[PDB]
Amino acid sequence: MPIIEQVRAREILDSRGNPTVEVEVALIDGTFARAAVPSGATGEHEAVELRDGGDRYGGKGVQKAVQAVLDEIGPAVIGLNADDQRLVDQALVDLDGTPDKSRLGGNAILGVSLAVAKAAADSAELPLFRYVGGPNAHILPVPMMNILNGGAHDTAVDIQEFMVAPIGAPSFVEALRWGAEVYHALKSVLKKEGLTGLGDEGGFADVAGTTAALDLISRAIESAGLRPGADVALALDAAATEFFGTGYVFTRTADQMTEFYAGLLGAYPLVSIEDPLSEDDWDGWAALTASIGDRVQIVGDDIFVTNPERLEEGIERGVANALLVKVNQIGTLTETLDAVTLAHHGGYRTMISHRSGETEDTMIADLAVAIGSGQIKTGAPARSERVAKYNQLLRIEEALGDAARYAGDLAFPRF
Ligand SMILES: [Mg+2]
């Protein structure tokens, strides 16, 4: 059966080197799955990691979340069937007791949520992406690679994340190759120039501004042998609630900023702009929607905080046209898939994302295909807690045989 027998937890370290929560579920059929949770630390609206505090691991201890698993979650889940993800995830949700998943920790609750679905697919003999996404799920996603980290990670280049997106590629296999080829070209470009140590997501680091970034990457694309736009597009997370009394800096206002964007949108082949105009600045979103609505994809990172209540409002109130999907924000798979399915009933595009503190876990690879997002943001072809998702996506495409199809240009309609 898909009947949960054991649920044990471990304290392990993420890509930053900071404790997180590893959950090991045993199904009665014999299945034993691993799953790891990534902090990547924010907001009140996001779920609340149960961290230790104290001087152990600089307050970043996860012992309580672990003990929380073995003491309470484990016995609460043990004996149920993994194959009722909605029922397990609700059961986990209640047992906690709060809005913020504060009491049992969202790090511990997702960890249980995910180690279930892993076992619930190795039960059924379904690769994770098939099982969770059924069998029509065959869309290998455009890799949105964050080659250059920026302001908020020097606030000199105010943009946070500068992304290569190989929409032109005939396959995911090729799309991976381009990205790596071009990341390695930009290594070359910046090596020759004074500008090459790595950032938290494998992204490279002073800089003149937004234009310098673009100017740099355009050249890297050309240097790699690819044409910008047709082969490799470009995209960014501004994280504009880092620029911010009225707080735009890049000095600009929301409507004034929409023009800054409009400028970039004309010359540089932008496929998607992430978290422009703050998180709570609803007015800015409607103006940005009005201004660049159908020339660029506009995606909500911190605005929507992967929470359906806020995205509903944004969709109803017409903020953005696509959502960034962070599983650890929301805390459960079922709640996460609801996020996807709400947005897909509504028709916002999906972009499954990582966090800055990642693990060797590659579930986001499978998850992204299963939801057929057509887009995955999982970092530069560099740190292996980035690359392992990419390799995983190799294998899935391998697995899919002729069934596979690479989102590519139909990932982003506007170009
Ligand atoms: Mg961001």
Residue numbers in the entry: 1 to 41, 43 to 154, 156 to 197, 199 to 208, 210 to 248, 251 to 256, 260 to 424
Publication passage describing the model:
Here we present structural snapshots of Mycobacterium tuberculosis (Mtb) enolase in apo, PEP-bound and two 2PG-bound forms as it catalyzes the conversion of PEP to 2PG. MtEno has a topology similar to other enolase structures, a smaller N-terminal domain and a larger C-terminal domain.
The octameric fraction was further used for structural studies. Notably, the pK a of Lys335 is estimated to be ∼11.5 in the MtEno WT apo state, unable to facilitate a reduction reaction on the carbanion intermediate.
